[PDB]
Amino acid sequence: KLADCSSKSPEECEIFLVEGDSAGGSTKSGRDSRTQAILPLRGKILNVEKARLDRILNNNEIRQMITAFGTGIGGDFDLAKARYHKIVIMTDADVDGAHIRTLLLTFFYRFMRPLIEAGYVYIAQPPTGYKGLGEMNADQLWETTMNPEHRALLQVKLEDAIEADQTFEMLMGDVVENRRQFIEDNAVYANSRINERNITSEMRESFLDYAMSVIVARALPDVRDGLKPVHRRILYGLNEQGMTPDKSYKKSARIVGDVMGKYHPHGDSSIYEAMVRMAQDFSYRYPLVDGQGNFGSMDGDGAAAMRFTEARMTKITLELLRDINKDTIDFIDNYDGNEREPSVLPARFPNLLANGASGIAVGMATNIPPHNLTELINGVLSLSKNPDISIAELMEDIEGPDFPTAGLILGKSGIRRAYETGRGSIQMRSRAVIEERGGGRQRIVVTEIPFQVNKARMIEKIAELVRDKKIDGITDLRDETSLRTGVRVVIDVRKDANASVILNNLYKQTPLQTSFGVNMIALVNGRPKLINLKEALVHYLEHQKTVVRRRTQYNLRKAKDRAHILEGLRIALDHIDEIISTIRESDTDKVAMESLQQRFKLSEKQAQAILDMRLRRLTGLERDKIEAEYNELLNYISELETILADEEVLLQLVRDELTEIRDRFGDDRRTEIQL
Amino acid sequence: GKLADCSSKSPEECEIFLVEGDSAGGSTKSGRDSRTQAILPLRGKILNVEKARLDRILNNNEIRQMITAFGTGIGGDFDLAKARYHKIVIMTDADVDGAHIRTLLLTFFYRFMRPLIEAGYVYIAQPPTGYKGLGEMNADQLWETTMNPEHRALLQVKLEDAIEADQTFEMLMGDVVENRRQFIEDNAVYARINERNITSEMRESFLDYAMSVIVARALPDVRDGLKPVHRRILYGLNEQGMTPDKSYKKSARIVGDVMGKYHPHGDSSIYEAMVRMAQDFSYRYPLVDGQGNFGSMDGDGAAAMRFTEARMTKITLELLRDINKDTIDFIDNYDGNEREPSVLPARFPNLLANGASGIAVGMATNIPPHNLTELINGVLSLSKNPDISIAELMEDIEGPDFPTAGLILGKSGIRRAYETGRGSIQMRSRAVIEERGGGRQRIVVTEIPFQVNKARMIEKIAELVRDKKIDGITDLRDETSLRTGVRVVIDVRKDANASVILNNLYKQTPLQTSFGVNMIALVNGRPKLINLKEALVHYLEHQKTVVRRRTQYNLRKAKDRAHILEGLRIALDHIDEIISTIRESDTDKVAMESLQQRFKLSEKQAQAILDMRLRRLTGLERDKIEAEYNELLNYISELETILADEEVLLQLVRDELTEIRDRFGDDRRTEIQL
DNA sequence: AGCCGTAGGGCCCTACGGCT
DNA sequence: AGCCGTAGGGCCCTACGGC
Ligand SMILES: COc1ccc2ncc(F)c([C@@H](O)C[C@H]3OC[C@H](NCc4ccc5c(c4)OCCO5)CO3)c2c1
Ligand SMILES: [Cl-]
Ligand SMILES: [Cl-]
Ligand SMILES: [Cl-]
Ligand SMILES: [Mn+2]
Ligand SMILES: [Mn+2]
């Protein structure tokens, strides 16, 4: 893949490292083929600080870099055997390019340190605003990044070797705590020309950029709507295109393309997979996407290519987006500044706990189980009537997690500790039974598997335990699952063998029993925070108060404006002859504006609304419609002002709407909790 | 492997379904009955055994997986008793490509498992139409409509005449194209366990796929010179107004919009089509303006469509000009939820301007690009003399003009190609011999032939030098750059004749390449081999029809607006009685009737009055109405004049074509040496 | 050959944290 | 010692005709 240069004089040669062929194209097209070589990599490279040496020396990209440099590694390193005197790191100008840069620097530092000490490692500075170099034209990339007469390179300098070792081991090592602490200490949450660059400063700044971006803008959900940026951008994308349940499905290809061009500047696989997960009833306790086609199965089967499937909203997603266009939530600019996206959805039901979450960030992660919507809402209502409610009282309503795959939970200890601190292991067990099958023989029937368990992989594991004789008593192992019966895994037992013992062994040796490690970390005020049940419900309730409040304010301003216009039009109808006369005798529409305003004490917008009136509106029924709309509008205004007068009426309104959602979408519990 | 076998092991009641891929294997595996129904997902088009040799067949993954799944062997080692299933159900997608796949599968079974067909073990599923594939259906639907034995409708393949079957498979699937082309020409019609004869299935399915590829994939239309994918792309860029004046648009949005609206096929085909249309070394007149990495002459593909952007070129507007003026017939799309153009107005001769290249079924096409100035000059000459000959046209259209410049040797091949539609044209690189210091010389190549991969050519030369198949070359370099352009340097050994080396390179490398002109195009939706004059004729007739329908559209529009303006002049002449008439009316319908009866107004006129905004009652508005009405009368007169005499119509076509020439015409790039 | 260009179809490397 | 789920990145079979 290396696109070497013509010259073979390392003193004037230089190799550029890019993320892939999408960038290698523009780079190869704009380069100077006499003294500039190009090595396209394949995305994220291996982290040598965590992987073992055998895996490093067998990695394709690593070996290709060693070959390209021809200097060796470790003790066999020879600076004189360098085929280039400048190794230019030129990743994409994004957070992932920063991560890649930190990985590359780690490799060079752990296996080619003299290359850094000699000042052979440089950093290219492509302009910002591009998702990658593949989006830039060749001439632009040449003039702004590669042309020696205009480029601005940073030469990597190694000052303190001890602080460098500590930095690389801290940020890239396998000890998470040091990294989390670094983030906590340095994270700044938002509410020709060859400069030298200290490798420590570059590692800390780049890795901090990637880490922050992953924490606040990728892996972790927001406590208010319980959504990550990709899911939020997906659903909003389905909203701006009117992909409502009443209207037909929409082509998944169009959805992913629109979302990717407008809001989510990342690969299609991430978006489409996210939507697929949101459409699967075995993954989402309350699915947010209605899918047409093959959206996978419990056996790990992925979804069909997006070019075959379609999707629209679910009825409850409408409740996630309800009132989003009434100044309830703050919009923000997108990545390219050509669109507006919601920073959060109204989330008229507690989504975070309803569907749960699970994300692997940097220096931390999150794992929240789903719950029953009825129980959640009942808990919110109890909290609204008692700010001092305790966790146990909440648990009178919220018995515990409620997984879409049903199943069993052993004991409330793990639940209790998880709701009281935000961390706790919960023992999930399949629903299995023992029954006869004729001739004094027995079998074990599994009808419900644990949450996030691959059924086919489980059955495969059992087949292994049977083959290796690591479990005795099993004679046959079938999977009679079907749509007309549901999950049904049959495990024949050998005659005269105790099936309960075999079952306990299966619980001990297979995913038939799995633990869920609750670790409820979520974004609060745009900051990662470990929260308990009460805090989550509280932040959600506050979000609801703010939502309904801002909605009432919006509807009030709108209603008042419409009331003013309707007043202008009612005046016009009371003096239609005077109006017509005023207009006809005016040469221009501006003169008509001024004359109407001055003669009828009308505002600019009222005279404008009169000038825009169609003659058909002078028919009787149209006048009646205007009057009626005005009176009803006065009543509506009075009701709104009533809501904004007393906070108890507002809060009770939140209670009423939450109760409506509960009565409409609430369902029975699926997962049984045994004492 | 990918096989998802069933629980039972009794072949008499077992049955295996063959699907095109995993997107369908998902729905099939979710909706099946896992006790007696197995599933084998393939990987798209399988190998055509009628054409491939045994070594290639026995190393194909899908073939071997099918043999394994059946467990019967192949050839003479076939044993029906070892069959793991008694029903091999072919269930490809309900489309033309699924029909092609079906013919391939049937071919394999017939040449390697004939007793399986004789015993009636091969069946064909009949999934409902309207889905791009089974991956678009839900599992319950697929089960109830196709797999459920209590309602499905299978076709059992029966082999009656073995001789006619052999001749059929050798004819449709064999490696002799002429027989296949003849079959298409003779049978192509261009616009519950039933038994099914394998011959009828092969002929019908293969004819379906063949027709679809000929008229709806590989071959262009003579009028706009576009294939369905390019037309649907450009139209897609037009429905969102992604014009050159506006900023670029994300390629992902373009491909998604086109694929959901018009082109129900893979994203790779669409995106590659747009990329080619954006490449200045591929299109003599690029129709797409690309932002990002859209490839190079060294075969380097374009960046993923998540990085690149694209909009129209200024000349594409001339392809779309007057589209909304009833110039071209619109049609329904594949799902019946959209309208697409069957052809673009094509205000300049695109087919010959950018050329074409397509591999269909039973035939193919290869048309070189040309110079727009010369083409237009030829069209104008033709409009003044229907009896013009090929040589006269060649007085204007000297020959092909490739975007890569280059050289063409002699007009013999050109002349034969323009006269008959078929002809070889010798393209030669632009090479020179120059000194490089110390009595040594080099060969500098600055222009390569059309559709030649520069890096691959250089590799070929390196091979000839390494293999000692050519003497005199000492070094080889590619000094190409944006500041210089194509520049391949070939050092010559001192005291060696460089002209001989250059001639040898022309004889032994792509430095000289042949272009096999084979101008086949769709005329009235039928493939036809055409010459230069015929192409120019069909195009000119398309222009005449376009401008005619445009003039008619503008005439009807102008007359309608004049009628409305008459109504409005009446309304303003009696504004008081109008207002009173409306006020006394309860409903808008009553007002309509009263106005019509009291002022001799039509429905649309009274409607236009009722929809009039009060701002239109200012004094100056009446004057504006009068002026617009008079100018409209003059305009009507001009239009009717144009539609009265065909000579002024043709002269208008000449005027617009001349304007296009003056705006977009450019100099010739390829030199033609005698 | 093996390439041209529209079509069918699909799988494998990496980072990151926590639990097993 | 391997999975969960958002992210970075990419390559290889096939049909079809003509030279
Ligand atoms: C599929 O299995 C493999 C196996 C091996 C592969 N080797 C290299 C390799 F690059 C790949 C993949 O990139 C090939 C391909 O590109 C990316 C994906 N495009 C799908 C798509 C469709 C429609 C769209 C869209 C994206 O974006 C927005 C608008 O509409 C799918 O996969 C490989 C893939
Ligand atoms: Cl934290
Ligand atoms: Cl209106
Ligand atoms: Cl079409
Ligand atoms: Mn990138
Ligand atoms: Mn298909």
Q: Considering only CA atoms, which residue is closest to the C1' of nucleotide C19?
A: A517
For ligand 1, atom 13, name the residue with the nearest CA. B304
Cβ(A120)–Cβ(A108) below 8 Å: no
Which of A 3-62 lie inside 8 A of B, CB atoms? 6, 21-26, 28-30, 32-34
Which listed ligand is nearest to B223 at the C-alpha? 4
Does the beta-carbon distance from A587 to B620 stay under 8 Å? yes
Assigned token pair, B442: 């080099």
Interval between CA A20 and ligand 5 midpoint (Å): 7
Residues ≥6 apart with Cβ < 8 Å to A188:
A212
The experimental method is X-ray
In the chain, the amino acid numbered A401 is P
Assigned token pair, A436: 């006869």
Report d(CA A270, CA A276) in Å as an integer.
Answer: 10
Q: The domain spanning residue A468 has which CATH number?
A: 3.30.1360.40
**C-beta of A306 in contact with ligand 1 (< 6 A):** yes
**DSSP per-residue letters across B453-500:** -HHHHHHHHHHHHHTTSS-SEEEEEE--BTTTBS-EEEEE-TT--HHH
Strand partners, A518: A424
Of A40, A41, A46, A33, the C-alpha closest to A4 is A33
Judged by a CB distance cut-off of 8 A, whether residue B572 touches chain A is: no
B94: which chain A residues are within 8 Å (Cβ-Cβ)? none
Cβ(A324)–Cβ(A547) below 8 Å: no
Q: What is the number of other CB atoms lying within 10 angstroms of the CB of residue B476?
A: 15
For B355-382, letters b (16+ CB in 10 Å) and e give bbbbebbbbebbbbbbbbbbbbbbbbbb
**DSSP per-residue letters across B403-454:** TT--EEE-SHHHHHHHHHSEEEEEEE-EEEEEE-STT-EEEEEEE--TT--H
**DSSP per-residue letters across A337-383:** SS-EEESS---SS-HHHHH-EEEE-SS-EEEE----HHHHHHHHHHH
Mutation pick for ligand 1 pocket among A252, A268, A269 (CB with most ligand atoms within 8 Å): A268
Give the count of alpha carbons within 13 A of A539, CB side only: 20
Of B22, B125, B20, B14, the C-alpha closest to B71 is B14
Report d(CA A326, CA A421) in Å as an integer.
Answer: 36
Q: Is B609 helix (H, G, I), strand (E, B) or coil?
A: helix
Which of A 604-633 lie inside 8 A of B, CB atoms? 610-616, 618-622
Cβ(A458)–Cβ(A510) below 8 Å: yes
Report d(CA B644, CA B555) in Å as an integer.
Answer: 12
Of B362, B321, B316, B389, the C-alpha closest to B536 is B389
- Resolution in Å equals 2.6
Does the beta-carbon distance from A253 to B260 stay under 8 Å? yes
Report d(CA B159, CA B166) in Å as an integer.
Answer: 11
Q: Is B157 helix (H, G, I), strand (E, B) or coil?
A: strand
Please report, rounded to whole angstroms, the spatial distance between the CA atom of protein residue B513 and the C1' atom of nucleotide C2: 14
Assigned token pair, B429: 């690189």
Query: What are the C-alpha distances in Å from A372 to residues A399, A401, A403, A533?
Result: 9, 7, 8, 14
Q: Considering just the CA atoms, what is the radius of gyration of chain B in Å?
A: 32
Of A519, A510, A622, the C-alpha closest to A572 is A622
What is the crossing angle of helices A647-665 and A620-645, to 10°?
110
Pairing of strands A194-198, A153-157: parallel
Assigned token pair, A427: 């023992």
Of A383, A358, A357, A355, the C-alpha closest to A371 is A355
**DSSP per-residue letters across A422-468:** SEEEEEEE-EEEEEE-STT-EEEEEEE--TT--HHHHHHHHHHHHHT
Pairing of strands B441-447, B430-435: antiparallel
**C-alpha dihedral, A586 to A587 to A593 to A594, nearest 10°:** -70
In the chain, the amino acid numbered A519 is N
Report the first-to-last Cα separation within chain B, whole angstroms. 62
Which of B 471-510 lie inside 8 A of A, CB atoms? 477-482
Judged by a CB distance cut-off of 8 A, whether residue B303 touches chain A is: yes
Q: What is the DSSP letter of B523?
A: E
Report d(CA A656, CA A660) in Å as an integer.
Answer: 6
Report d(CA A32, CA B482) in Å as an integer.
Answer: 9
Q: Considering just the CA atoms, what is the radius of gyration of chain A in Å?
A: 32
Q: What is the 3-state secondary structure (H, E, C) of A76-143?
A: HCCHHHCCCCCEEECCCCCHHHHHHHHHHHHHHHHHCHHHHHCCCEEECCCCCCCCCHHHCCHHHHHH
Q: Which residue has the tokens 């938002």?
A: A190
Assigned token pair, B145: 């409509």
Cβ(A253)–Cβ(B267) below 8 Å: yes
Burial of A319 (0-12, 13-18, 19+ CB in 10 A): buried
Instruction: Tell me how many degrees the CA angle B423-B426-B432 measures, rounded to the nearest 5.
Output: 165
> Which residues line ion ligand 5, judged by CB < 5 Å?
A 19, 92, 132
Report d(CA A297, CA B34) in Å as an integer.
Answer: 14
Judged by a CB distance cut-off of 8 A, whether residue B578 touches chain A is: yes
Helix then strand then coil, in percent of chain A rounded to 5, is 50, 15, 35
**C-beta of A257 in contact with ligand 1 (< 6 A):** yes
Residues ≥6 apart with Cβ < 8 Å to A263:
A233, A236, A237, A334, A335, A339, A341
A173 Rama sector, left if φ>0, alpha if ψ -120 to 50, beta otherwise = beta
Q: List the single residue in B143, B247, B611 with the smallest CB-CB distance to A614.
A: B611
Report d(CA B146, CA B151) in Å as an integer.
Answer: 8
Q: What is the number of other CB atoms lying within 10 angstroms of the CB of residue A537?
A: 24
* Structural domain span for residue B504: 428-517
Burial of A129 (0-12, 13-18, 19+ CB in 10 A): exposed
Report d(CA B140, CA B33) in Å as an integer.
Answer: 11
Dihedral sign (CA A460, A464, A470, A472): positive
Query: What are the C-alpha distances in Å from A72 to residues A41, A110, A313, B98, B597?
Result: 19, 12, 56, 53, 99
